[PDB]
């Protein structure tokens, strides 16, 4: 099934600070293991291919310095130091050196870099109800969800109908917007649409929740700003069907 | 020095359109060439390989032929689907014979495939916040796939890219964009002006 | 008439030395034309014929890096073969890899070779189809399995049918 495990999945990294990544090989058919970065421009760059326990290698690219270590037949480490620009790190594996055998990409470690820890805010979430005009015109009802004022830009928005996650009728923006698009460290917004038949919407027993998972501070960061410590949290907003 | 160039950043097609994404490389020797695809929210994954001049690789209805004479490996598909929407990466295997493991990846090409919307019905509805308050949004929806949505001129009024939802049970698709601000002078009637709306739209009272 | 290109790459692990002796010897039509010797000082590939005096400096740089890397492959796989045949370390063992291509008058491929031999006895070899492997014994079976699964025959065949035949053609033009 899954060939590789990566930890951490994600991590908020103060500028200049170091982070340790680990990658576990689940299948020894694919013993060659690599690191690749993806920068915020979506460019993929090879960092290392390391086969033997004991192989240690070192590289410097714009935005991060790296020490990669093949620790055992099943464990690959990466230290990312002096981080100045966010990236994702994919472990990969292969049955071959990699001139010929394909690479299998693991699930990736997403590293976010922020200058300042007091530009971290959760989203506010709101749900906007279908227009009566739309219900008249189409026999369909669209709900809209907004997450606003969040920083940094890493959220996951899902729709929940009667306690069940849905996918049908859903469209979420691929990317957040900067609310103050100048301000280099602007907070973000995100929209999503869930659209049902007017019948479904009209039933007052149907409950609609917009859930925004936000990726923020840990309980092992210091924080003294009066306003609530903006931790990894879920913020939801809800609407109930109206007969009206 | 060794390099991979993909001529396009972004390509927008309808369903069933003809697709070509250009890949050119610079390498001496006998490098293997590859295509990788990254579906949205996922990691990159292998599509196919070619290891010899004039070899055609293929998977999932896509092909590319190794052309050493034009150092080309252009990805093609006769008839794209919405599910092809993704980023395609061309890669050069290590050509020095040292087999270091390095793949050299082109910049990537974003492919957005738009559905053919059979019964367009453009409109701009107002939606109110469920938590009462005087907060509201504007839904531009039900417009054809060849309509495009540009930002505002004002920077205090936020406006989002088109987005396709699929109501699977009633085999129906619809585009939409959302527009919202706090300017008090904000208007649903006058909010996509800075966009080439259809003339045909609805604009209720 | 017809023509051949053949390379023979050998690694011998040594008793109190531990760093193995690596060699590569290229032949065309059974005449030695290139050699690499790991026991040389700062060792490089070196021409052994006058008609190899015009390949140009980056050919020699490129295949000298290949030798250094191929040395890492012979030494890893010698110590894998210790495990597979349950022998002990600080032994004297030889791995031989013979490969290349025969062409007819017309320069088209007649036959390809990929043969491996451990301690003088053959270990695994590529059949004439350039698609299936003959494994000598139970240890070789492990290898055959991994290589069927990873499509190693196709990998070697791309060399055998492309680069090998094209370079044999150029070497026959160089040395009339």
């Amino acid at each position: 099934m899954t060939l590789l495990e990566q930890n951490p999945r994600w991590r908020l990294v103060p500028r200049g600070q170091a982070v340790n990544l680990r990658c576990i090989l689940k299948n020894s058919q694919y013993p060659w293991m690599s690191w690749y970065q993806q920068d915020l421009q979506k460019q993929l760059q090879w960092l290392f291919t390391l086969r033997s326990p004991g192989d240690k290698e070192v590289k410097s690219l714009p935005g991060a310095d790296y020490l990669a270590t093949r620790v055992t037949d099943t464990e690959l480490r990466l230290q990312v130091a002096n981080m100045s620009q966010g990236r994702t790190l994919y472990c990969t594996c292969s049955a071959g050196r990699g001139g010929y055998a394909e690479q299998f990409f693991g699930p990736g470690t997403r590293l976010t870099v922020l200058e300042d820890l007091k530009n971290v805010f959760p989203p506010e979430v709101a749900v906007f109800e279908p227009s009566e005009a739309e219900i008249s015109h189409t026999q369909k009802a669209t709900l809209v969800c907004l997450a606003t004022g969040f920083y940094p830009d890493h959220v996951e928005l899902s729709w929940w109908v009667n306690g069940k996650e849905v996918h049908s009728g859903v469209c979420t923006d691929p990317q957040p917007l900067k609310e103050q698009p100048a301000l280099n460290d602007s907070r973000y917004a995100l929209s999503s649409r869930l659209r049902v038949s007017a019948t479904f919407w009209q039933n007052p027993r149907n409950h609609f929740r917009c859930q925004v998972q936000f990726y923020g501070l840990s309980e092992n960061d210091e924080w003294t700003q009066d306003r609530a410590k903006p931790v990894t949290q879920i913020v939801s907003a809800e609407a109930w069907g109206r007969a009206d | 020095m060794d390099s991979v160039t993909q001529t396009e950043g972004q390509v927008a097609l309808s369903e069933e359109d003809f697709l070509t994404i250009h890949c050119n490389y610079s390498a001496s020797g006998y490098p293997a060439l590859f295509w990788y695809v990254q579906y949205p929210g996922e990691g990159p994954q292998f599509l196919f390989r070619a290891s010899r001049d004039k070899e055609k690789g293929s998977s999932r209805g896509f092909e590319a032929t190794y052309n050493k004479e034009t150092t080309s490996f252009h990805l093609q598909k006769a008839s794209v689907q919405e599910s092809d929407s993704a980023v395609y990466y061309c890669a050069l295997g290590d050509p020095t014979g040292a087999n270091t493991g390095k793949l050299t990846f082109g910049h990537g090409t974003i492919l957005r495939v738009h559905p053919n919307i059979q019964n367009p019905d453009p409109a701009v509805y107002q939606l109110r916040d469920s938590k009462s308050s005087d907060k509201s949004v504007c839904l531009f929806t039900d417009f054809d796939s060849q309509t495009n949505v540009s930002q505002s001129k004002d920077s205090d009024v936020y406006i989002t890219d088109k987005c396709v939802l699929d109501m699977r049970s009633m085999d129906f698709k619809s585009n939409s964009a959302v527009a919202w601000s706090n300017k008090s002078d904000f208007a649903c009637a006058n909010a996509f002006n800075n966009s080439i709306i259809p003339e045909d739209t609805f604009f209720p009272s | 008439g017809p023509h051949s290109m053949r390379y023979y790459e050998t690694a011998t692990s040594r008793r109190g030395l531990g760093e193995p002796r690596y060699t590569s010897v290229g032949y065309v039509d059974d005449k030695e034309f290139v050699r690499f010797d790991s026991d040389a000082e700062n060792p490089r590939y070196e021409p052994q014929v006058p008609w190899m005096e015009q390949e140009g400096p980056e050919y020699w740089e490129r295949i000298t890096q290949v030798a250094k890397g191929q040395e890492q492959w012979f030494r890893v796989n010698l110590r894998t073969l210790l495990g597979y045949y349950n022998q002990s370390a600080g032994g004297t063992h030889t791995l031989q890899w013979m490969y290349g291509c025969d062409v007819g008058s017309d320069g088209r491929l007649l036959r390809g070779y990929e043969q491996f031999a451990y301690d003088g006895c053959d270990y695994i070899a590529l059949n004439e189809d350039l698609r299936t492997w003959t494994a000598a014994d139970m240890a070789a079976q492990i290898t055959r399995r991994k290589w069927e699964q990873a499509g190693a025959a196709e990998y070697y065949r791309a060399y055998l049918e492309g680069e090998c035949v094209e370079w044999l053609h150029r070497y026959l033009k160089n040395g009339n």
Partner: peptide
């Protein structure tokens, strides 16, 4: 033209 560094281990 010697072969490239071998893609696979025994």
């Amino acid at each position: 033209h010697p072969g490239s560094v071998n893609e696979f281990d025994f």
